[PDB]
């Protein structure tokens, strides 16, 4: 008296693994349908995702690979069905059809339907609703809820989508936390402070003049004095129009915090003014002192400042960390690029990716936004969220987020843009999308 | 004893009007299943893409609308169609289920199937392969292939999607034929000798510096004579540094010659030196002088360069201007943003769009690829291809490819890039792409 569950193996492996754990124990056998490899037909294989499936729902024995060996041809569907699936008198048989494509599915439902039509076997149809979480179940006006019933993490997720090397950091692991071993937290909480005090325009201002035409130019500029020192002596050919006499005459209060909180010597200034080497410094001495601190005020502090604001928020969620959520996200898979997101979220087996910028320039805010649409869709279904923060104004966000949707067919539910007036309040605004 | 074609209307509606198109004549009677309104649901309207398919078509009387009230519950779906679905004995019923979404096709076929398969009436399943344009049945062997048999154009293309305020142009119509009176010939000519002398590397560089340093900055820069000579006298300050004067002494010739094909009125030399207004030169003098030659040269010349050069290679093909290839495509759907084709070309029913830029800067590249990918897609299916141009090279071009291919799932026959070695003979090798 043995049931059968049989799932369509296709391209996206997320649903028939939130499927397959929530019907596991309530089956004896498990068809898995996939796709074989044949290159006249230009078809490829699903065989790396149906094996991935089998191994992470612990199937084992009770699981049977059904390949098809042409899935655009009806007959050939049919034939290899009607020689493959097994022949056990089962007294249930549920078909899972919520992958594969439009063609296999049509047959594969109505082959194995007709089959135990006339045998009185209970038969039932499902599909995993990709907007509602629900498990639709063929002529049932009711659909359980898997959100909160089926939890996957970040290796899981990544696994059944084929990917390996897998490498994030968390809180304890975070690679500027090692650069400044015992001031991260102070430097932390000082732009945690401005910012959460709206000073997040006032900031990136200061960053793009006069910082950035201090400590950004040509190729390793803070790793020879000389280049440095040739980059300061122009400068200050602009006079008193020129970044020097700015950043010493012009620095509000709590960027000189900031620059304060770092270690003495690792600060880009000397006292109230800037920091000018002379002739003695080594490449050495210029490098410790400034080479990781303008790499940080140059746009990794964003990074850290929104992830810690989520943890924060995430404290009463039972999420965990470095398996629910982390921060760069790295991965890679065979014949494929590598795989990059800066935050990462999961909620039940909701994917949430976080594209990060303090740009406002809308060419790069919109790139960003196009890639991480695709990377989050990649390895988390239509089930996913894409959220992209940039430093652009509330108008500003709203019509790169209009142009975005309606480009890319995504709904506000699957792509957010959030802007700089976002950012003090970025951890309750990006949960309160996500625990929607 | 007539026979039925059946269509199921989603929001692709090419391969309908394709599959329509090719077996208008020997059927007799069409039912157009769709999505009616449900608010209750959130589901959306089909109707404006069945009523679109009905007229360009020509169905009249022939077209049956079967509307369904809940295309995600299969009860509701067999309700409707056992209700509203012709009663009359034809003698073939020919359902074509490209259209729709996974879910209701299997309840549609299985319906429909087993309806007259108990009625003993011959019942045919047909999809069109948007890969290989062949209408695949269900238990025959041999698919028609289309690609050769079926045509669609511009206007019939845009209106089956909704689109409306359709504008474009065209060899005669191209506006900037106006701007330049009486010259546009020798300009187009004088820069496609530059180009096909291969160069358009040196062309763009000058571009970059010192052109757009002259011409660009202030929104109105080119419509005040005071904006302007502000923006030349900070500029003429950088003594032997000043882009005034790399554009006087190191415009290469062949530059000085595109600049000597405008006429004398829309110049922006005067003689071998840049023309810098005095006080008493009007604000629409200075806007009629450059402000069109400026947006030409900044990027525009290369739109009409490669456009001319694919209609030089059309020349005695089954393509027609305004019907099949045009320049400078603009659309507008109901409550939707604008779109945005810079060249589209239809081949069969295949539309290529293509999306040009003279940059190299990845980023840019990058992003332009993105949404060429997405909008052909839009008014194009699946069976659309999309071509971007760049100013890159080889290697880069090369790479770019790669990548955007993967992250939109796009075939290296469907995305296609090219770069700056593709310039002399874009029109050979676009041409050669497209015919393939």
């Given at each position: ?308 604001q989520?943890?924060?928020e ?102 957010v843009?959030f802007?700089?007036?976002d950012w003090?309040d970025i951890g309750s605004k990006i949960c309160e999308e996500?625990?929607?």
């Amino acid at each position: 008296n043995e049931k059968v569950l049989v799932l369509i193996v296709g391209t996206n492996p997320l649903p028939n693994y939130v499927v397959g754990s929530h019907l596991k124990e309530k089956y004896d056998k498990f068809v898995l349908i996939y796709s074989e490899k044949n290159d006249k037909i230009n078809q490829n294989s699903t065989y790396d995702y149906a094996k991935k499936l089998k191994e992470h729902l612990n199937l084992n024995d009770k699981c049977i690979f059904l390949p098809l060996s042409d899935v655009s041809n009806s007959e050939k569907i049919i034939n290899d069905l009607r020689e493959k699936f097994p022949s056990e008198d089962f007294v249930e048989v549920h078909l899972n059809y919520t992958g594969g494509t439009k063609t296999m599915v049509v047959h594969i439902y109505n082959f194995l339907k007709e089959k135990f039509k006339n045998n009185k076997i209970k038969f039932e149809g499902s599909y995993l609703d990709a907007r509602d979480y629900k498990l639709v179940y063929d002529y049932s006006e009711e659909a359980i809820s898997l959100k909160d019933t089926i939890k996957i993490d970040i290796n899981t997720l990544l696994s059944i989508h084929l990917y390996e090397d897998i490498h994030f950091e968390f809180y304890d692991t975070y690679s500027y936390k090692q650069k400044f071993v015992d001031s991260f937290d102070k430097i932390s909480q000082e732009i945690e402070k401005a910012i959460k005090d709206d000073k997040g325009e006032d900031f990136v201002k200061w960053l793009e003049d006069p910082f950035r035409k201090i400590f950004k130019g040509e190729n390793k500029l803070l790793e020879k004095t000389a280049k440095f020192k040739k980059h300061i002596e122009k400068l200050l050919k602009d006079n008193d129009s020129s970044p020097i006499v700015k950043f010493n005459e012009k620095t509000p209060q709590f960027i000189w915090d900031i620059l304060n909180a770092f270690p003495e010597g690792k600060k880009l200034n000397d006292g109230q003014k800037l920091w000018i080497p002379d002739d003695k410094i080594t490449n050495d001495n210029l490098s410790s002192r400034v080479k990781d601190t303008v790499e940080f005020l140059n746009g990794k502090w964003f990074e850290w400042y929104v992830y810690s604001q989520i943890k924060s928020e995430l404290l009463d969620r039972k999420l965990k960390e470095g398996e629910h959520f982390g921060i760069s996200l790295k991965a890679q898979k065979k014949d494929s690029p590598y795989f990059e997101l800066d935050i990462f979220l999961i909620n039940g087996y909701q994917l949430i990716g976080i594209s990060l910028t303090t740009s406002s320039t809308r060419e790069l805010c919109k790139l960003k936004g196009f890639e991480v649409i695709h990377r989050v869709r990649q390895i988390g279904g239509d089930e996913s969220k894409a959220i992209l923060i940039t430093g652009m104004d509330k108008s500003k966000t709203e019509d790169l987020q209009k142009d975005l949707a309606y480009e890319t067919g995504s709904t506000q539910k699957r792509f957010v843009v959030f802007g700089i007036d976002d950012w003090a309040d970025i951890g309750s605004k990006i949960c309160e999308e996500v625990f929607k």
